[PDB]
Design a protein around this ligand. Sequence first.
Ligand SMILES: [Mg+2]
Ligand SMILES: [Mg+2]
Ligand SMILES: [Mg+2]
Ligand SMILES: [Mg+2]
Ligand SMILES: [Mg+2]
Ligand SMILES: [Mg+2]
Ligand SMILES: [Mg+2]
Ligand SMILES: [Mg+2]
Ligand SMILES: [Mg+2]
Ligand SMILES: [Mg+2]
Ligand SMILES: [Zn+2]
Lengths: 47, 62, 230
Amino acid sequence: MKLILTADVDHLGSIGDTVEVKDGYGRNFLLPRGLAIVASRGAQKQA
Amino acid sequence: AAVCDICGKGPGFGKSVSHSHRRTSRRWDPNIQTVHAVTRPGGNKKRLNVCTSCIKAGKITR
Amino acid sequence: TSKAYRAAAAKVDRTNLYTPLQAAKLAKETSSTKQDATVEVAIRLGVDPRKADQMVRGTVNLPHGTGKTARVAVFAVGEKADAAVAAGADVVGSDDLIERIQGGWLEFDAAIATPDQMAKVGRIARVLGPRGLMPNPKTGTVTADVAKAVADIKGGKINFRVDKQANLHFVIGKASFDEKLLAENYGAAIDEVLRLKPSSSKGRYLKKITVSTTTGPGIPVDPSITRNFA
RNA sequence: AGUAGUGGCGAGCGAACGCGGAACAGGCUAAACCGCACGCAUGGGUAACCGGGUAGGGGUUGUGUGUGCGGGGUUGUGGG
RNA sequence: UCGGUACGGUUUGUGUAGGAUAGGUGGGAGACUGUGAAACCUCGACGCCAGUUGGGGCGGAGUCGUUGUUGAAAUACCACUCUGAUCGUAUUGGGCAUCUAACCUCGAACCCUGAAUCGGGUUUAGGGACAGUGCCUGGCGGGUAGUUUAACUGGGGCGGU
RNA sequence: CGCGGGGUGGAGCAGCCUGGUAGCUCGUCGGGCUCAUAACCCGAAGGUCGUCGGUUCAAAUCCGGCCCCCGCAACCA
RNA sequence: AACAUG
Ligand SMILES: [Mg+2]
Ligand SMILES: [Mg+2]
Ligand SMILES: [Mg+2]
Ligand SMILES: [Mg+2]
Ligand SMILES: [Mg+2]
Ligand SMILES: [Mg+2]
Ligand SMILES: [Mg+2]
Ligand SMILES: [Mg+2]
Ligand SMILES: [Mg+2]
Ligand SMILES: [Mg+2]
Ligand SMILES: [Zn+2]
């Protein structure tokens, strides 16, 4: 699955861009803490 | 547990076949895992039994 | 040490597989700086020579020859020597030929022994051991028809035999030959190996093949082309 | 039709294609997209919008997206 | 931190006579600054057969080897292989150890709670990608279950058939 | 049926991954040592290396051929 | 280490 991260995460990438995540680092750490959102509509909010 | 609390997916029954083709009854149980789900970010956590084909989709949040 | 090893990587590449067109081309370009040489083709088969039923041994004719002097010694007396005197036997001796070879004279490139002489040539095959000059009935050198046996050597009919570790080594001709005289030799080379595939072989048969010389590097050759050597 | 087949090819099990009748019937939704409200974001001549064009005026309520309710839509010769 | 796979580089091997039969096959018989492992120095085993031709850190200022022959024997070159070791590239896979956020806690305090050694929720102290469970897979399994255990026979049983 | 091990003198065993001598212990005979006997030490005798048939300069050792023995896995005419 | 007998 792909995500759109908001804050700064080390060893993972910069802000604004999409990134690959291994599906358990997403919904346990990045998604409950609000540091990343899913990429379904956010590709147009980024544009 | 063996019943999903969202999609209702329970077990199926069948037969276990041996080399001499002796057929006895076993049960195919779903992959029911426990989750602590929220309804809005920062709210309280309710404990549920869900199956892994719903954690793989986005039927719940954590 | 310096010049011969630096001449390798300037022309050929290891990972790049080369066509049989380009392999004979680089066989002309590698041996040009040095003297003339014999273009060597090494074939790695996928059979085990340790099993005697899977033993690979046969003959193959070079229609363009190989550029060889072919000093053919013929072991024949009487009318058997009269069948080879018009065939091209350069040295026709007598019954004392047992004694001339043991004295220190081994100046012949081929040995053909008639079955009337096999009770006496067998004392000579001990000193003809390592260099490969003993008469062998399995290679077609021990027969009663010695008139056509001289022309088998002059045409360049190579007798191939697989080694201990399943690595064939085959010659196609001198470095003075053209790109098409060697390729038609190389075109008839692989097909006779495929005709000499054994019965109970498994796996990939002709796995690795290369083109080398006497005093030079090798050429990585692709076994994928077995139809379009011309 | 106890047929094709299926079976320690043992005991047994056993269709459909099609033909004759009984009775006859077909209808709504989802999605694209256009609105309204709510929720999030972005922006102050950077820009549009104020039913379309025509002109000025307003001088920021535009633009993007999420959730429900109306409109639109229902097809195989493909329909929208 | 380790391992094998394809490929590439270096190195390793061997009897009395020979750079110890290149270890083996096939080609082919003159190749380049090699003084000499006297030096500055050659191996990590080989220093046992036999001392290896690199650790080229050097002397480059010159030349060895290919020519003689002997067990079967070639000795420069040089080939793509065999056994052992090592380096590099690419790919793939397994151990061990920290982290917190999934998961676990019959550890504690607080609340729902008026009466609660149940339960749930919040905070905290810890365990932690292990355990438990699902699926697939091998083992063990009289713990349990359905059954088999032939016939002739001066009666059955033992022998024999 | 598939893998990978085993057979050596009268007995009990080394040697087999590196092709070359073919051995050691026990038992039989004879000899040393001692004043003499035991104990000890030595030599000789004793080999189809399970069998054959090839590779091979050369095989107890490598590969096949059967011959008995064993281990684990298989075994729905 | 070594042995013991008449
Ligand atoms: Mg329940
Ligand atoms: Mg059922
Ligand atoms: Mg039943
Ligand atoms: Mg599923
Ligand atoms: Mg997954
Ligand atoms: Mg009808
Ligand atoms: Mg609607
Ligand atoms: Mg029972
Ligand atoms: Mg019953
Ligand atoms: Mg009786
Ligand atoms: Zn479910």
